[PDB]
């Protein structure tokens, strides 16, 4: 129909379906924007601080490199957690235990920060999965009113069904628009979760082994 | 996972629609 | 109108009633648990001895899950009496937590797969409803030569009503399961934080035993 | 009609009865495992109340003695006494336990493999039964297209019995599909409950014999 | 005509359908061969497990698990055990060996899975996606049928009555390659999974035996 | 009508969708050819080199054999990681701690070596999954435009509007064309995952056992030096 025609060519319940799908689309586009630019900042910071921290031959050197990151470095707070257990296991001659004790601490904390950013997963994944099924409801509603239009005519041609056909197809197409980029950029962001959080775990094992080698020095080399 | 092939029934509904004007 | 398609639709609506009742109960309970856990997590973050762990968890009431885990810890404190093995206990006690906390999660493990798979296969039982309806329609026009699909148009519409309520029951059950499993992850994560803190408390205390006897 | 039961085809009727007879076989699977874990939850409930405070491995034996010969706890005590008889001469208490434990845990998977069978029937058949029904649809609508290319009016009741038997194939696929995956989700809750609680019992025995081997490794040490 | 029913639509659809049937036949050969092979293995390890649960010493295990035929996998497990026993020579550390040797067998157990892990993609994934192949062939056939409807416009009743039924038949041959093949690896999991138990039991047991045999050092041959 | 007469007549949105399907297919073919050629270079080369190194038997002859592999020896870089830990073993009198510090380091890099080729995979696999749904939206777009076009006046006669529905179904056709072999290629890349990661984990455990037996010599055979 016309512009205001195709505004009115879909029924007001079908119109509510349309607006619900497009609004869920746009708010998760904003969620996409947030995740994309924030992970952008995080991976450029990852690149620069990875170059800054690969050279960390001492963990005290790593603290020095954690200093000139800004206060908002995740690795800075991981070294804060490291010094925390240096002060909590202050007095632990069991150098063999501590690090394991520390490790799984590590194997939550900024991973939980990563599990912060996995909060928006249900939006993209599940709304993109159910949006064609919302389109299925749009088909059910439109073809039910199409059957009403057949029962008003009993002509059984394309004319007596076709506006409800167009409304159901409009609901279907808007369900698919709300479907496909959501699930696919869900999979994009989960792959980003994988790569980024994995390299963060690489940095975590780097810090673990910095402390592990330094406490091996204090255990066996400072024995001697 | 292997769900959406109710769309095959939707194709069957298209066949039901082309059976109509006859 | 029709009754068997209506039986399928009221099965959908009554499963929706069970689902919403479970959702309401879970969600109110989870708010209680999580805001209480927010405050009590701020409390027990600096529970710095096992005695301080009991004393800070003392005012929680008997509804503290973690107080029973302090009871778990004191239980294997008392059961490990007689032998000098500090060293085994802990892992075992960790695994006691690896039992108990999972049990806590399995405390709510019952209706989860129920409503998850209900939201999964609700379009499939709506599909069965429309299969039943359209098959009865073509039994109604099983003569030699019919025309005028308006004689079977409202029957197929009432068949599609089954798919409609199948979708209506399908959406929020899978939705609410994904929300609930998401904060299963969140709440079990915070509870594992608490469990790890208790393990580190008792681990540092047994290290101060093995080191205070050493130093 | 009785002719309408064998209407226009019998091999699609053959797959109808194939779906519902595989359903009956898995119904036998269902009610069997149902009364099985019913007996198990009642029994292990009672036996849980018993052996939760069996203070010794001797109490783990004697408090298990009233179970009858058909308890899994009896088999786990057999595993424990087996490692006792195999660690004769082993002054290393400290090893044994680890070597013992996963024995149990392989046995625990054998516990799952006590009923590892039957499950794939319910689960996978309840998944793919409407695809069997889908082939029934394609068979029926191809035969109806043979009919409406024989008539070439192609309207409207000339397609109707083929459509009806195609939907009958769909419906029997759906009847086979839904309660089968339902029953496997029920059985996965049985997996969770029985696995977890029997693992609690296994951890109980491991704690008991762990503390007893600690009392042997520190027998004349702590006094 | 019956050969008319063969020759209605097209020959590319014929090529797709016979490709489905030939992939079916080669995976039937896969199913048959792995079936008779794992029966040989099941009957074998059945009586072997009967005789080797009673293998009360590792030398009794070398006696019993030798033959059994010369082609026992357990013989190669005994070979790897004696290999690292000969590679245990010089090091009095009992405590290291076995740990490593554990996962040796477990990596060998991985090799055992990697014995038969290759080729399962054919069976399972072709059983999954064959109706999707037939779906595409049906899309092909119905689009050519719509070309035929465009050839005879203003009347679309029997312009394509049979030929669409051939394209759907393509889906049917996708359907005829759909059901059992997935099921096959389901088959080729389950008691094979028990095999992942069973053989993975006994050498582990032999490990346990060897562990207790190392106790026959570490608790018995410890003090000369 | 001719294919250009069916195609330029069709909706340009559906045309852009189908050409995006074919271009993502070209990306997939390029990535597949690259992983295939590189992986069999790895397979043949490091298979013969695996036959060499499984009985290198010295862990310095493991270095010497892996010295002349060419520059692309991943295994010699893992030997460089081992010598790095030996340089981190300086002062470490505890042989037993080192090993633990050694262990995961191999499977810190190796799956990263796996994630050397870990990129591009989820891309083309999920392309092969969801491309027919993209073509399904192409069908809904085209059939929606056609059945608005026969509903505005409103007309009848599907037979004179059916080529629009066929040009719509062409989107699902090309979506399936891209959909099948991309899933196929990730399944054979998962077989590559199995072969490469398992085999190089065998190499990793080989080096672990070499240097592990050497530290067992230094801790127990050199206990009686």
């Amino acid at each position: 129909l016309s512009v205001w025609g195709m505004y009115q060519h879909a029924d007001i319940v079908v119109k509510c379906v349309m607006i619900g799908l497009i609004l869920a689309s746009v708010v998760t586009w904003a969620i996409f924007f947030s995740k994309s630019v924030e992970f952008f900042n995080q991976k450029r910071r990852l690149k620069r601080e990875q170059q800054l921290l690969a050279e960390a031959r001492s963990l005290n050197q790593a603290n020095d490199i954690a200093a000139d990151f800004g206060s908002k470095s995740l690795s800075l707070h991981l070294l804060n957690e490291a010094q925390n257990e240096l002060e909590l296991s202050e007095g632990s001659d069991d150098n063999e235990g501590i690090k394991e004790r520390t490790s799984f601490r590590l194997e939550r904390r900024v991973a939980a920060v990563g599990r912060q950013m996995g909060r928006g997963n249900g939006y993209l994944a599940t709304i993109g999965a159910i949006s064609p099924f919302v389109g299925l409801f749009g088909t059910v509603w439109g073809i039910m009113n199409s059957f009403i239009g057949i029962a008003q005519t009993q002509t059984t041609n394309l004319a007596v069904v076709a506006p409800g056909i167009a409304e159901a197809l409009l609901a279907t197409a808007i369900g698919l628009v709300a479907a496909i980029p959501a699930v696919v950029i869900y999979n994009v962001f989960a792959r980003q979760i994988g790569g980024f959080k994995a390299m963060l775990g690489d940095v975590a094992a780097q810090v673990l082994l910095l402390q592990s080698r330094d406490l091996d020095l204090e255990a066996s080399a400072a024995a001697h | 996972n292997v769900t959406p092939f109710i769309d095959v029934m939707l194709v069957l509904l298209i066949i039901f629609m082309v059976a109509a004007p006859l």
Side-chain angles (χ1 to χ4, degrees), chain A residues 2-7 9-56 58-118 120-153 156-166 168-223, chain B:
Chain A
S2 297
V3 176
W4 185 259
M6 289 177 68
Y7 176 75
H9 197 192
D11 199 359
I12 191 69
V13 176
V14 178
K15 192 185 293 182
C16 288
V17 171
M18 290 169 66
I19 298 301
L21 289 169
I22 295 300
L23 283 177
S25 177
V26 170
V27 69
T28 316
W29 283 116
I31 293 162
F32 158 70
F33 291 152
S34 66
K35 297 289 184 181
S36 64
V37 72
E38 183 172 359
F39 296 159
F40 174 76
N41 297 317
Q42 284 301 108
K43 194 175 181 179
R44 190 172 183 177
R45 194 185 73 182
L46 169 70
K47 189 174 181 179
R48 63 175 295 277
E49 295 188 353
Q50 183 184 5
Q51 294 297 319
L52 286 172
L53 286 170
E55 68 184 2
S58 176
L59 191 142
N60 196 1
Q61 179 182 2
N63 293 120
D64 297 330
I65 301 161
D68 55 353
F69 286 166
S71 178
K72 293 177 73 174
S73 178
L74 292 167
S75 301
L76 178 62
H77 293 170
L78 291 171
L79 287 177
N80 289 320
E81 182 176 0
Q83 187 64 44
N84 191 5
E85 279 296 325
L86 287 174
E87 295 172 353
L88 289 174
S89 297
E90 188 69 29
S92 176
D93 288 334
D94 188 5
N95 295 319
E96 187 177 2
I98 297 164
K99 294 179 179 179
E100 295 177 352
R101 288 192 283 270
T102 305
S103 64
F104 186 71
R105 287 196 64 186
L106 299 175
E107 304 300 321
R108 304 176 76 93
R109 289 288 300 275
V110 174
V113 172
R115 290 183 295 277
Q116 175 186 2
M117 304 307 292
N121 293 327
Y123 299 145
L124 288 167
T126 309
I127 292 170
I130 66 168
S131 297
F133 304 148
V134 180
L136 262 66
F137 173 71
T139 59
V140 171
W141 194 264
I143 294 167
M144 181 181 71
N145 286 318
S146 297
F147 287 155
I148 299 299
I150 297 169
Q152 291 177 357
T153 60
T156 320
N157 289 318
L158 294 181
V160 304
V161 197
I165 294 173
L169 287 169
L170 184 61
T172 310
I174 292 170
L176 292 159
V177 168
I180 298 168
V183 172
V184 304
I185 303 166
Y186 171 73
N187 290 310
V188 168
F189 279 159
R191 180 253 183 82
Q192 295 182 4
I193 287 164
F196 189 82
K197 198 177 182 75
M199 191 176 288
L200 192 145
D202 307 337
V203 177
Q206 172 66 41
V207 175
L208 278 164
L209 288 171
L210 284 174
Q211 190 172 2
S212 182
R213 288 165 289 172
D214 291 330
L215 292 174
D216 279 325
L217 291 173
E218 292 183 354
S220 297
Chain B
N1 291 319
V2 202
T3 60
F5 303 100
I6 43 90
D7 183 74
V8 182
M9 188 188 73
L10 299 175
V11 175
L12 191 274
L13 263 297
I14 299 167
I15 299 167
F16 178 75
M17 286 305 297
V18 75
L22 304 176

